DNA sequence: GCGATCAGCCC
DNA sequence: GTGCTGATCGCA
């Protein structure tokens with residue numbers, strides 16, 4: 001039964017009520033400078049469809065969009081806000097975002113369109129976007145009659161679903177999480193994405209030619225050491241060369257065949273000179289194809305900026321993710337790849353990059369939630385946590401901690417957070433389970449509070465069916481009762497790790513909101529560019545660095561109040577690389 | 581063209 | 592523990 005609506009040729013006062021479900025459709029996955037194909041509005045007066053060229057040129061409509069007293073309910077308001085920013089139009093007054101609401105109610109549903117959200121409440125009078133637009137090479141905007149009905153049905157669903165979703169969020173004690181954290185954050189991310197990050201393409205291109213030369217030398221050497229040419233980028237062909245022609249021992253296999261992972265190769269290095277060159281080739285090739293060519297592909301030719309898109313409704317822990325490009329995995333550990341960061345520069349002359357990062361926020365959060373006396377005292381003394389853990393599990397004085405002992409203690413600390421397992425640790429430390437388990441038992445002996453938390457949180461997950469973070473983010477764990485050991489164990493690790501990683505996510509999100517407000521009150525030109533899980537990257541006039549050195553760490557350290565202090569380190573320079 | 585595999589980068 | 596990307600491969 002078709003849905004009734006007015007396919008308007010002009011904008012009327014009736015369409016500008018102070019409460020409405022609004023749809024500003026952007027079909028392209030990457031919404032930066034992308035087309036708005038249609039508009040739909042549903043309010044107390046009816047349902048309307050408006051052509052973009054018409055509405056967006058209407059002075060009254062544009063004013064309505066930018067009036068914060070005129071409330072709008074939408075799905076993925078950031079997409080619409082950014083597409084509008086590229087057209088010089090401000091979107092204000094978004095009081096409800098169905099995507100973010102659905103995300104908070106259950107991140108596991110993977111809601112990515114209105115239909116999926118509506119299905120959560122048995123509402124099915126709307127089609128999935130993929131059904132209307134198709135996918136891949138077949139993707140396409142349908143004729144006006146089909147498009148208009150779809151957009152109106154989406155607006156209609158949003159209009160109907162707002163109350164039931166808000167009611168459930170309220171029952172879950174998550175309504176403030178939506179209204180005071182995620183929605184305000186959505187507007188901040190929109191600003192960051194739109195601003196973009198300036199890239200020194202000349203610098204990137206120069207590095208690219210250096211690697212092209214280095215890869216050519218190592219490539220030929222590999223063929224030389226192998227006695228023939230083959231596709232190194234082919235694990236299949238590489239395996240034949242290594243485990244058949246050169247007879248290297250098979251230490252590990254994959255579902256399909258021989259493993260050629262870096263971890264395995266390192267062990268085979270002693271047997272043949274070719275292995276070292278394969279490792280080098282893998283290093284250079286990764287930088288060339290992924291960080292040089294891949295980054296250059298998404299830089300905008302006119303402005304030389306990259307405009308990432310932060311997916312705010314994807315991770316099961318509350319973290320943000322980044323795409324096109326993913327600016328959350330730019331090399332830094334290895335010096336060769338770290339140089340890539342010299343390519344990210346300030347967008348204005350005489351401006352600099354400022355970066356601030358939380359120091360061990362996950363372990364501090366664990367100290368707080370577990371109320372472990374030993375761990376809390378360690379952070380109150382601001383001790384090197386890995387050295388301290390080594391002293392405790394190995395029963396030695398600070399002076400007796402060797403470099404290897406600290407390395408292994410650090411591995412134990414990472415596991416503890418990321419759901420400890422006498423299997424993942426061993427594999428990571430190149431040791432056995434019995435041994436790894438011995439380290440774990442020693443850890444819990446030194447940190448009994450953490451042991452109690454791990455036991456209690458798993459019990460809570462089983463009883464309630466989910467675990468929660470500091471700001472009430474939730475994650476359901478139905479597999480916690482599984483009779484399959486591996487399936488159940490993974491759920492148990494999630495029960496232990498989500499409150500830690502998730503609370504850390506809550507904190508940095510609140511810090512971003514607090515910082516944006518402080519920068520405005522202070523009348524500073526500085527602004528946020530990126531977020532990388534536990535760090536914030538900004539750019540600003542060189543004349544504002546001194547003020548930022550005091551302001552940013554303070555705002556981040558005071559975002560929330562825990563049983564232990566929060567610590568923030570900071571640096572600034574002419575490029576992202578120098579902000580070290 | 582498209583999806584399963586493999587690999588490797590970040591926190 | 593959470594993510595995103597690129598080169599191969601054989602399939603359609």
Ligand SMILES: Nc1ccn([C@H]2C[C@H](O)[C@@H](COP(=O)(O)OP(=O)(O)OP(=O)(O)O)O2)c(=O)n1
Pocket residue numbers: 170173174175176177178470471472
């Ligand atoms: N109705 C609610 C209540 C809480 N929360 C989430 C976000 C809040 O920041 C957090 C803590 O809620 P509290 O009830 O503890 O309120 P505050 O912690 O904000 O106030 P108080 O200092 O009284 O604890 O839980 C929410 O989303 N919706």
Ligand SMILES: OC[C@H]1O[C@@](CO)(O[C@H]2O[C@H](CO)[C@@H](O)[C@H](O)[C@H]2O)[C@@H](O)[C@@H]1O
Pocket residue numbers: 029030031076079111112113309311312313314323
């Ligand atoms: O606008 C981002 C928002 O849209 C979703 C779908 O509702 O993801 C789409 O857009 C992303 C950005 O280009 C793509 O990575 C993704 O593949 C596409 O489906 C949400 O997941 C996201 O929160």
Ligand SMILES: OC[C@H]1O[C@@](CO)(O[C@H]2O[C@H](CO)[C@@H](O)[C@H](O)[C@H]2O)[C@@H](O)[C@@H]1O
Pocket residue numbers: 229230231232233234
């Ligand atoms: O010269 C291209 C040609 O070489 C092969 C093997 O001889 O692959 C080599 O070059 C590719 C492009 O740089 C790499 O991806 C690959 O790892 C390297 O061995 C052929 O497959 C290709 O047609």
Ligand SMILES: [Mg+2]
Pocket residue numbers: 357358359360534
């Ligand atoms: Mg850090």
